[PDB]
């Protein structure tokens, strides 16, 4: 058996083909087992509609999830990614840095 804690990165991207659109991303990497719970938050509340949830593995024991959706951030909103996994005794909340 192997278990590996996810690394979690939260960032925003503009697709170059539609630069006015803005996507909030949670990249959850190198975890095992694959069982996981991942939400994007807006001021502490789960975002219900996340349009993209892309899972892959490299080695049979290394998983990668890109969890992202279109958003419209304002300076006064707080965005984050919340991850639950067997390796995390408490849910891990990673805040979006506005400049990322």
Numbering used by the authors: 0 to 99
Lines quoted from the article behind this entry:
To examine the structural effect of other amino acid substitutions at this site, the crystal structures of seven variants (D76E-, D76A-, D76S-, D76G-, D76Q-, D76Y-, and D76K-β2m) were determined at high resolution (1.15 to 1.52 Å). Comparison of the crystal structures of D76E-, D76A-, D76S-, D76G-, D76Q-, D76Y-, and D76K-β2m with those of WT- and D76N-β2m revealed no substantial differences that could explain their different stabilities and aggregation propensities (RMSD < 0.6 Å over all heavy atoms). Interestingly, two of the most rapidly aggregating variants (D76N- and D76Q-β2m) share an amide sidechain. D76N-, D76Q-, and D76M-β2m, which have intermediate in vivo growth scores, aggregate the most rapidly. For other variants, the loop structure is maintained despite these hydrogen bonds either not forming (D76A-, D76G-, and D76Y-β2m), or being reduced in number (D76K-β2m hydrogen bonds to N42, and D76S-β2m hydrogen bonds to N42 and T73). Together, these observations indicate that the sidechain chemistry at residue 76 plays a role in protein stability and aggregation, but the behavior of the variants cannot be rationalized by their crystal structures alone.
Here, we report the use of the TPBLA to explore the role of the protein sequence in determining the aggregation of the naturally amyloidogenic protein, β2m. β2m is 99 residues in length (10.8 kDa) and has a seven-stranded β-sandwich immunoglobulin fold that is stabilized by a single disulphide bond linking Cys25 and Cys80 (31, 32). The protein forms the noncovalently bound light chain of the major histocompatibility complex class 1 (MHC 1) and is important for antigen presentation. Another example is β2m, in which aggregation of the wild-type (WT) protein is associated with the deposition of amyloid fibrils in the joints of patients undergoing long-term renal dialysis (dialysis-related amyloidosis [DRA]). More recently, two single-point variants of this protein, D76N and V27M, have been identified in amyloid deposits in the viscera or tongue, respectively, with the former occurring in the absence of kidney disease.
